[PDB]
């Protein structure tokens, strides 16, 4: 019953090289969009912003690429700070 987060997830890290982050995705997700208490947000296109939860802070990143490896999708991002 513990409410550790009021937000759904989008994927999980699988790789770290230099300052470019590599992400894999979940299964049902196709159409660029995610939902939450305030509404709907686009998450997949280049030029968009994405966030990682790291303990007591939040790391912010910007998307660069999008590719295949129902096949397997993959994303690349670059960090620009933290909240």
């Amino acid at each position: 019953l513990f409410k550790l987060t009021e937000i759904s997830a989008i994927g999980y890290v699988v790789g770290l090289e230099g300052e470019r982050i590599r992400i894999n995705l979940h299964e049902g997700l196709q159409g660029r969009l995610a939902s939450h208490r305030k509404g709907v947000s686009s998450v997949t296109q280049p030029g968009d912003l994405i966030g990682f939860d790291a303990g007591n802070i939040l790391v912010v990143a910007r998307v660069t690429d999008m590719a295949f490896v129902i096949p397997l999708r993959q994303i690349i991002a670059y960090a620009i700070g933290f909240v």
């Binding site: 009021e6 759904s8 709907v40």
Partner: protein
């Protein structure tokens, strides 16, 4: 007259929310009895407002003798017609069991007169109910667009739409047999058609956009139970000949454990098994991540569906949209100590700090034929009739 998050909206910022909602993983629709009045149907007031008029000599027993309905409700025309039929069906079994010969023939008349006003109104046409190719007409023109838009707005890999309804009429099957679309409904076979509750887990594929799903929560006119113990589906022509041309044009009700509408014989362990498996699927679709639900035609006079919806806002990925064309009067009435449970229920959530909810009013601006036009066509979809000029040239070749 469009309230999101407790405060107001405008047409464009809402027509841009709709489009983003239809692109989620799971999409569904819930319809009611007010959606079929543009095709030959009738709401649930007009049914009692006519039973009252045509049969007054029975309206006294129900109130003064057996206590099945109340006076103020009957005068204000606010009675539920499904629970009355269920209770009157359960009063007859006891008498049939313990051999009371007066209370057994007193209820056959009541039930014959009740099963005769809802049938006559669920026939959207009349004596053309037994004929063929009825979805080709003009009344069934927006039902088609609904399905077309719900199917053509998906992507490859994304699931297929779902449809729930409370009617017991044949307006979405006629209108799909014409487009060329296939609906799953649980039944299989032609010469002996039977209910298998796992056919909801199947889908097509080619080996060289075909299907959808339909859930009927209160039954249909073509479902019945035989001298065996199994439910069977048949076609309209066959039903008209067996058990529908006698109901109206005669006085016959002796098969009291035979029909499966509108939610009557739920004390038999074989007929309730088919009602349960629909709510058990509603309450399982409405509990998934990234879900959207559009409601229309439904008056919130049911306790369980409300207790089921209210408990799904606790997940932050479920969104609702509601159409209610009498919202002003309800706010008025509950402003000063009044109103019924439906109005209180809708006003309760009209005032909330929840961006998941959105309410729409305005009379003719919240009707079915406007709900439809708020939905988008794709830009690469064929619309111009460019094949019809050519099917008559093949007929001129007599």
């Amino acid at each position: 007259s469009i309230y999101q998050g407790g405060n107001k909206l405008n047409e464009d910022d809402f027509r841009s929310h709709v489009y983003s909602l239809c692109q989620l993983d799971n999409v569904g629709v819930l319809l009611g009895a007010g959606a079929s009045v543009g095709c030959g149907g009738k709401t649930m007031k007009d049914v009692w407002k006519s039973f009252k008029q045509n049969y007054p000599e029975l309206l006294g027993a129900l109130i003064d003798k057996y206590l099945l309905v109340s006076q103020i409700d009957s005068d204000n025309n606010l009675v539920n017609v499904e629970l009355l039929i269920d209770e009157a069906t359960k009063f007859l079994s006891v008498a049939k069991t313990r051999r009371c010969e007066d209370e057994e023939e007193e209820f056959r008349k009541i039930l014959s007169s009740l099963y005769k006003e809802v049938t006559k109104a669920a026939l959207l046409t009349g004596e053309q109910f037994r004929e063929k190719n009825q979805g080709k007409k003009d009344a069934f023109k927006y039902h088609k667009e609904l399905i077309s838009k719900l199917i053509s707005n998906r992507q490859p890999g994304q699931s297929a739409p779902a449809i729930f309804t409370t009617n017991y009429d044949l307006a979405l099957e006629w209108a799909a047999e014409d487009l060329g679309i296939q609906l799953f409904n649980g039944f299989s076979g032609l010469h002996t058609r039977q209910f298998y509750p796992q056919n909801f887990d199947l889908a097509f594929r080619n080996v060289n956009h075909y299907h959808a799903y339909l859930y009927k929560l209160h039954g249909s006119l073509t479902w019945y139970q035989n001298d065996s113990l199994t439910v069977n589906e048949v076609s309209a022509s066959q039903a008209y000949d067996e058990y529908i041309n006698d109901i109206i044009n005669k006085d016959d009700f002796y098969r009291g454990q035979h029909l499966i509408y509108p939610g009557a014989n739920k004390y038999s362990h074989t007929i309730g098994f088919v009602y349960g498996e629909m709510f058990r699927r509603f309450g399982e679709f409405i509990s998934k991540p990234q879900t959207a639900l559009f409601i229309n035609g439904f008056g919130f006079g049911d306790y369980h569906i409300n207790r089921i919806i209210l408990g799904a806002l606790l997940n932050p990925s479920f969104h609702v949209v509601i159409y209610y064309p009498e919202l002003k009067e309800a706010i008025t009435k509950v402003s000063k100590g009044g109103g019924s449970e439906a109005e209180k229920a809708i006003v309760t959530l009209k005032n909330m700090a929840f961006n998941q909810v959105t309410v729409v009013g305005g009379g003719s601006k919240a009707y079915f034929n406007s709900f439809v036009e708020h939905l988008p066509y794709p830009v690469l979809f064929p619309r111009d009739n460019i094949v019809d000029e050519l099917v008559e040239a093949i007929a001129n070749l007599s």
